[PDB]
Amino acid sequence: RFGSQIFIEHVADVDTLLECVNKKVPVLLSRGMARLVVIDSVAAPFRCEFDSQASAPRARHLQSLGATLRELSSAFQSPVLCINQVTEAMPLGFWDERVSPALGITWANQLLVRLLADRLREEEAALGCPARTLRVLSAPHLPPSSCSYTISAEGVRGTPGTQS
DNA sequence: CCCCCCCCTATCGAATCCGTCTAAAGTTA
Predict the structure, then answer these.
(1) Is A87 helix (H, G, I), strand (E, B) or coil?
(2) Within 10 Å of residue A82's Cβ, how many Cβ atoms?
(3) CA–C1' span, A17 to B10, in Å?
């Protein structure tokens, strides 16, 4: 039974997200209802309040959120997946690339495995189909590599024989 | 009253025309 075992929550502020991850996710994880956490965007709440002159409170909030998420994941042996946005690059491993992860080094220090789903739309689009590539940025045990995939009516499928 | 520290962000904005070639078919005392 698929739909009956997926839980949906909605938040609209950084404080709301902090309170939710503090006092709702542990209740769900304690009873064994779920063993997986997905955040559809972490950059969306943060890119609205804190400007370029308020980096200290932003870093404090990011550190607190990362610590809480890592503690929960370690305690309940449940994966945590975070979806992130990108910014424009106008020293951190990004030289021949026009986009970088949004939050910065403070949030990048809290992570374990970093992927980068990319679509090359400006070029090789006249061939008739989109070109989608999933790349491994960093991992303690995974070499940097990439593969190709497509999105169809049934889900995401990886193209065989295309690993870098 | 005493002695030492913190942190990145975010795309924009179109211009500029050139250079000619190849001739064919007689008619009516």
Answers:
(1) strand
(2) 19
(3) 25
Q: Which of A87, A118, A111 is nearest to A100 (CA)?
A: A87
Resolution for this PDB entry, in angstroms: 2.6
Q: How far is the CA of A31 from the C1' of B4 (A)?
A: 45
DSSP assigned state of A40: S
Experimental determination approach used: cryo-EM
CB A44 within 8 A of CB A12: no
Length of chain A: 164
CA end-to-end distance (rounded Å), chain A: 37
Residues A119, A134: contact at Cβ < 8 Å?
no
Q: Whole-angstrom Cα distance, residue A27 to residue A30?
A: 5
Q: Which nucleotide is nearest to A89 (CA to C1')?
A: B10
Residue type, A107: W
